[model samples]
Target: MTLLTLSDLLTLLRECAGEEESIDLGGDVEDVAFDALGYDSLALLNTVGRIERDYGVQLGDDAVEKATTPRALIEMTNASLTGASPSAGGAARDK
Candidate 1:
């Protein structure tokens, strides 16, 4: 149930790109292109690497090119997570 939502992506952006990078990743900016959002390719690439490590996701090489907006990145991450091994979702859930 841990798909990369907009909120999560924003958090990653802030973490990877730093707080003073002129990126206002806080509300209603999901569709904004990363360029205007103040993140260059390097920042996005770092975020992607963090995503892979944190979520255990194996994104395709082209995935980075398609992540122009937060929505696209979130969808791509969720899609990849959805296609991952369900039985390998190691965790103890509650409620």
Candidate 2:
């Protein structure tokens, strides 16, 4: 049960946008408004909501702020994978 990262979110957005622009996945999600992304606010909200539902995590509005780039998104997802807690590294697993 791996947690999804911001990069995964970006990939989802890219799929949703279906555009060819060079959108920096790691860049700020707020860089473009809904209108610019060719999606209405409702659609954007719906998409995000779906992601939360799927991930079993409540990605508040601040989630977008942290997703400054694809790399950042990956970091967020990686963090979420660990129950969003500040713990040891990934290899801290026992057999």
Candidate 3:
């Protein structure tokens, strides 16, 4: 199982946004927002779906809006992995 991190989330977002072809977000990605990174709702949803499938987690409908930054997503994912309660960010993983 792959551990999700801010970097990994950023890379996935870049790919989802189709920015991988032109953008080289080598590092320094934590502060970036999904919209700023060119990820639309569709892209964000798809990426969230991928993360859900990857980690066997379930993100709420509002997950996209709540998890604005890659770092936030990382925290949310870590919480899910550890069987914590749904993050304040609104991601509720299956228990």
Candidate 4:
């Protein structure tokens, strides 16, 4: 399997939580923080749950924190999907 593409995340986000009228979910939002995009932690949690349900994977509550941005979510989803090796990298925090 491949990574969860940005478009997929957007769709899932929309499906889980209706898009905010002020925010353009279809536009460039990969790097934007959830708050800036009009989505809160609750919304993200729902999306994460949706991802887990759809992909049949376990992201745990940890993924919610790591998925602060679309790019972050995409990375985390792909890592989980690909079954990243145990020696892949260090902590999930870098910035």
Best by lDDT: 1
Name the lDDT of candidate 3. Answer: 0.68
Put down candidate 3 lDDT per residue, 1-95, tens digits, no spaces: 44577666766767787775323655554677867755557877787888878876654556657888777777677767765445356556967
Candidate 2 — which residues are off by over 4 angstroms?
Answer: 5-7, 20-47, 59-61, 84-95
Candidate 2 vs 3: which has more TM-score: 3
* TM-score against truth, every candidate: 0.76, 0.44, 0.66, 0.71
**lDDT (10s digit) by residue, model 2, range 19-93:** 554354335664554455454544445545666667655434577555444454445555566666444557847
Q: How many clashing residue pairs, candidate 1?
A: 0
> What's every prediction's RMSD, in angstroms?
7.9, 7.7, 7.1, 7.3
Error of 1 at 67 (Å): 0.9
TM-score of 2: 0.44
Query: Where does candidate 3 stray beyond 4 Å?
Result: 21-23, 84-95
Cα lDDT, model 2, residue 17: 64
Ranking by lDDT: 1, 4, 3, 2
> Which 10 consecutive positions of candidate 1 have the poorest summed lDDT?
20-29
- The weakest ten consecutive residues by lDDT in model 3 span 20-29
lDDT tens digits by residue: candidate 4, 23-47 = 3566768898999877888877888
Tens digits of per-residue lDDT for model 1 on 1-95?
37777777788888887775323655757888889767789988998888878886765768779878988877888988888644556566975
